Paper text:
Y126C is less frequent but still occurs with an appreciable frequency. The Y126C mutation induced a small cavity on the surface of the loop-sheet-helix motif. In the wild-type structure, the side chain of Tyr126 is sandwiched between Pro128 and Phe113, forming stabilizing hydrophobic and π-interactions. These interactions are lost in the mutant, explaining the high stability loss. The side chain of Cys126 adopts two alternative conformations in the crystal structure, one of which is pointing in the direction of the phenolic group in the wild type, whereas the other, occurring with lower occupancy, faces the backbone of Leu114. Residues 115–120 in the neighboring L1 loop could not be unambiguously modeled, indicating a high conformational flexibility of this region. MD simulations of the Y126C mutant showed an increased structural plasticity around the mutation site, with alternative conformational states occurring where Phe113 collapsed into the pocket but also more open states characterized by a flip of the Phe113 side chain towards Cys124. The flip of Phe113, however, was also observed for the wild-type reference. The strongest stabilization overall was observed for the Y126C mutant (particularly prominent in the series at low temperature) where the mutation site is directly next to the ATO binding site, which becomes more dynamic upon mutation and is, therefore, poised for interaction with ATO. However, the mutation-induced cavities for Y126C and Y205C are relatively small compared with the extended surface crevice in the already druggable Y220C mutant.
Numbering used by the authors: 96 to 114, 122 to 182, 186 to 291
Amino acid sequence: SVPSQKTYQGSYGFRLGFLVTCTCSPALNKLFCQLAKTCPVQLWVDSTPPPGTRVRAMAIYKQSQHMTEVVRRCPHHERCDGLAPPQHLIRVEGNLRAEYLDDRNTFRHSVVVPYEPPEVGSDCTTIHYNYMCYSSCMGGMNRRPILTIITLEDSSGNLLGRDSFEVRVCACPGRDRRTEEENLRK
Ligand SMILES: [Zn+2]
């Protein structure tokens, strides 16, 4: 079954926040980012989850007619850090404990890091993601919009919380955000 995108704050009050290489549109719930550049995603909790809590990131297609298709890199960007497998769209930057996972039954990719409390000077835990293929790449996303689903999980993989956002990976994020926002006003 297609991974759920249902927002679920859960017992710890889990939700995301956001912070031109990367720009977020709250009105569109959409992140616009350049290829392979830092995308800061903030984790907010009302209380601290138990030891061994994990944070998983996974991409799915937004449109229902493409939801059962695995999101992966196009051949050009696949065939081009030594930790992320070449097929994975999403990689984590600056984390010594990233796990790159392929689901045995769905073939979907994800990247998991341990949950850490907020870094000094912050009320939220910031994770730096990189997207390794453009929304427009033929043989990959092929202009189809995607969602990133962030799941807070216990050490066994049980769901503690879930949030999600749309992503466009593009060369001019600031300009594309304005275009899509101008389209929503019209
Ligand atoms: Zn590509």
